[PDB]
Design a binder for this molecule. Structure first.
Ligand SMILES: Nc1ncnc2c1ncn2[C@@H]1O[C@H](COP(=O)(O)OP(=O)(O)CP(=O)(O)O)[C@@H](O)[C@H]1O
Ligand SMILES: [Mg+2]
Length: 282
């Protein structure tokens, strides 16, 4: 099944050193000659997501589904961008934009290299609120928004990544009946955890937990509480505490995203407006 507008010649692709791995594939650095149509002569440094030697049938299928999802999203400043793919005659290669600073979690943990200021943190939250606004506008739910799924480029631009669990949503709620779920519990909304319902407001909840990760410089959500005990505490109204240096205006923002009623939570459009005002006065 070839899509000519995304197919990239294998000869033009030279693989390099590894960049990371999980239990769904691996990512290697690579050189791609003429993949950028704006400069069709220069070789572009890219990242290639591919299967592993111990890959499964679902691993291949998930990588194919993540490829099709990224085709629909399009380019944005705060979203990792699909550049091409190698599907015909050989292993599936998913070629995406390269980010040299890693993922946001290890990025912030390595600044407790550089050093993070209050403006830097607010700048991070603003860009991630803009990437989700365009993502929500494109009729998409990420379902796996976390600090580890955000990439940082050489010029410190936040890139939303990991669309393996992303789905398209229309005007009503997304809903399926599952033998068991696959979303990280500590970032899930109560309706996603209990009712198996996911909307753009469920991504707002994850954004709140994402805010907590950012202002803790890479801490783990609900510190000291196992995944097993989080179930009962969410039903009873437990929320995370305010970080050490985090303005109350930004903690009320987190508590807004963490509202029980999904429709009562802010929209990503409103988060961009509020963060814009907070950022300009710094
Ligand atoms: N464009 C890119 N540039 C540099 N590193 C990248 C990258 N894209 C992904 N990576 C890194 O490759 C590593 C593994 O990739 P990926 O994030 O897709 O696996 P994963 O996180 O879904 C499995 P797990 O969560 O169990 O570790 C990650 O640490 C990620 O930061
Ligand atoms: Mg990840």
């Amino acid at each position: 099944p070839e899509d000519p507008k995304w197919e990239f010649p294998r000869d033009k692709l030279t693989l390099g050193k590894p960049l990371g791995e999980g239990a769904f594939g691996q990512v290697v650095m690579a050189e791609a000659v003429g993949i950028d149509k704006d400069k069709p002569k220069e070789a572009v440094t890219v990242a290639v997501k591919m299967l592993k030697d111990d890959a499964t049938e679902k691993d291949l299928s998930d990588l194919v589904s993540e490829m099709e999802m990224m085709k629909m999203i399009g380019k944005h400043k705060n979203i990792i961008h699909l550049l091409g793919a190698c599907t015909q005659d050989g292993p599936l290669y998913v070629i995406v934009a390269y980010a040299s600073k890693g993922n946001l979690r290890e990025y912030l943990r390595a600044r407790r290299e550089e050093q993070m200021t209050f403006k830097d943190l607010v700048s991070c939250t603003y860009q991630l609120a803009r990437g989700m606004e365009y993502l929500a506008s494109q009729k998409c739910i990420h379902r796996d928004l976390a600090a580890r799924n955000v990439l940082v480029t050489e010029n410190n631009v936040m890139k939303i990544a990991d669309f393996g669990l992303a789905r398209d949503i229309n005007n009503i709620d997304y809903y399926k009946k599952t033998t068991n779920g696959r979303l990280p519990v500590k970032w899930m909304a109560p309706e996603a955890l209990f009712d198996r319902v996911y909307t753009h407001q469920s991504d707002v909840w994850s954004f709140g937990v994402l805010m907590w990760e950012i202002f803790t410089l890479g801490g783990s959500p609900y510190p000291g509480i196992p995944v097993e005990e989080l179930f009962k505490l969410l039903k009873e109204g437990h929320r995370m505490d305010k970080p050490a240096n985090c303005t109350n205006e930004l903690y009320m923002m987190m508590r807004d995203c963490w509202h029980a009623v999904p429709s009562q939570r802010p929209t990503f459009k409103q988060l961009v407006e509020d963060l814009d005002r907070i950022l300009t006065l710094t």
